[PDB]
Amino acid sequence: AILIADSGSTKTHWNVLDQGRVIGEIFTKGMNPFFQTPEEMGREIERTLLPQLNSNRFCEVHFFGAGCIPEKVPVVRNVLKGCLDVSSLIEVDTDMLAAAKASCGRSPGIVCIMGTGSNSCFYDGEKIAANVSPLGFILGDEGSGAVLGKLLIGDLLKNQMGEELKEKFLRQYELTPANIIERVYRQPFPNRFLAGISPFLAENIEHPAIHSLVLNAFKSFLTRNVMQFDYTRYKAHFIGSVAYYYKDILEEAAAATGIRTGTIVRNPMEGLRTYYS
Amino acid sequence: AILIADSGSTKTHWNVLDQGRVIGEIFTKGMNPFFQTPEEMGREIERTLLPQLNSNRFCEVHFFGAGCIPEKVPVVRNVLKGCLDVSSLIEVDTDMLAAAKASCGRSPGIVCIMGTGSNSCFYDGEKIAANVSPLGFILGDEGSGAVLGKLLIGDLLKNQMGEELKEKFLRQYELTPANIIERVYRQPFPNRFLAGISPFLAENIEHPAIHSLVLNAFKSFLTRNVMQFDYTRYKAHFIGSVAYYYKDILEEAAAATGIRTGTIVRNPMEGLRTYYS
Ligand SMILES: CC(=O)N[C@@H]1[C@@H](O[C@H](C)C(=O)O)[C@H](O)[C@@H](CO)O[C@H]1O
Ligand SMILES: CC(=O)N[C@@H]1[C@@H](O[C@H](C)C(=O)O)[C@H](O)[C@@H](CO)O[C@H]1O
């Protein structure tokens, strides 16, 4: 009856709710209209949800995803229309609203996302009131795996952390200098590439230089994004993968810059299903 | 009868030298194999110079251009071979060697490029011995117009330099945030876009925040790139447009980083032309 989604830049999880229960859970690759034309978006969409759904018809469909700026929301909604059957109108918004509906539900509060990309907001109870548009992983997205990987590759190959870690990194993923620039500048979804090579940071987090890179990235995010809200009486609900597995470094950078924190979960799906019933 | 060129990712100049003089000069847009396949680069080459190029059949031909790393040198080298007719063997290199031959000729010294992109090297007298390969404007290129433009836009729309400069920037180039993000993530040659909006820094240099942003970008460049060379007895020949019109901030950052300075040219061609005959 209802279909729920949350499209990250690298992956997408889909949920099917009927009479308030979960009758199906789906995974797909990431969809961002700034990395995917509607053909790629849609032909992928053909290959995705439809095969694992006995019935392709619904009454309500709610799709939240990265790159879903208002200028691109109708584009993505028409992509989903040419593949689904819903009795009412399709809602299409950003992943921030999914995170907010998941964390706070019908109540207000601050919500931030740290995964493939980064983002920060204040939320009313039914809609996002304010938002720092993150500009992406080239002009912002500070503190997220794609940016972490961007920083790490840059620092390593500028000989800023020595040869040992540089060689362990380039050997662990069997990459030459050419692979990076080809993968980042000429190959689809370079943010996936960066966010995927970024867990090397977690692997060698005991090194001060790597721990400091992660900490200073978290610092810059909080400074340039979360500080723009009333962070002195609001418990920032953090959602995302980077924020979950780097919990300690995030709490480090938060106590440094005075940013407050509340509940920190990795995926909004279980909080989203609670909201819809 | 020889032709020498130097194509930055934004522009390209071609020269045909006979009788010790320059007998003809044509200009075309920039070609970079990481934002243009070599055919597309090439499909313009038909449109620009050849229609006017009286003879495409001459002796030696030597082409230097950005993004033209060893992994990419042969592809571009055959593209010029399958239309062009040159009597001797093909030279293919990066813009750094043109800058070095122009700046240093047959003598050594440190040579740096500051325009659309960044790069760093020490040069012997026939070829570059050491180099910090800049990885481009997404993983490095610190101190370059695209990176300067990247930083300024990022800071502005995250409200890090106020509303006055942010608004003056967005109305003066008649850009909205979505247009920005569309131009950087979906539009060809985003490095030109950033480097073209970057002169806003020089225009508003009286603001402390912008002067410090430009200076600190220059600082880290010297730090992460030039410091990797012998900067204590070598007078760094800086080459480029950014380096000429931001001369004072560069000398500031040079006294800041103890780094020495030499010659500042924006374009190398007559020094390149001086080298050949
Ligand atoms: C241009 C781009 O990719 N933005 C995305 C965001 O998308 C919304 C629509 C936005 O741009 O504001 C997304 O919420 C965050 C977290 O996933 O990462 C950013 O990179
Ligand atoms: C990935 C990329 O585009 N790098 C280019 C450089 O190209 C060389 C070959 C290199 O990549 O090492 C170029 O020298 C400088 C200055 O123009 O700008 C960078 O952006």
Residue numbers in the entry:
A (entry chain B), B (entry chain A): 1 to 277
Provide excerpts from the study.
Unlike other bacteria, the pathogenic Tannerella forsythia, a member of the red complex group of bacteria associated with the late stages of periodontitis, lacks biosynthetic pathways for MurNAc production and therefore obtains MurNAc from the environment. Sugar kinases play a crucial role in the MurNAc recycling process, activating the sugar molecules by phosphorylation. MurK and K1058 are two sugar kinases of the cell wall recycling system of T. forsythia, sharing a sequence identity of 44% and separated by a single PGN-scavenging operon within the genome. Structural and sequence data showed that MurK and K1058 both belong to the group of ribonuclease H-like kinases and are members of the ASKHA (acetate and sugar kinase/hsc70/actin) superfamily.
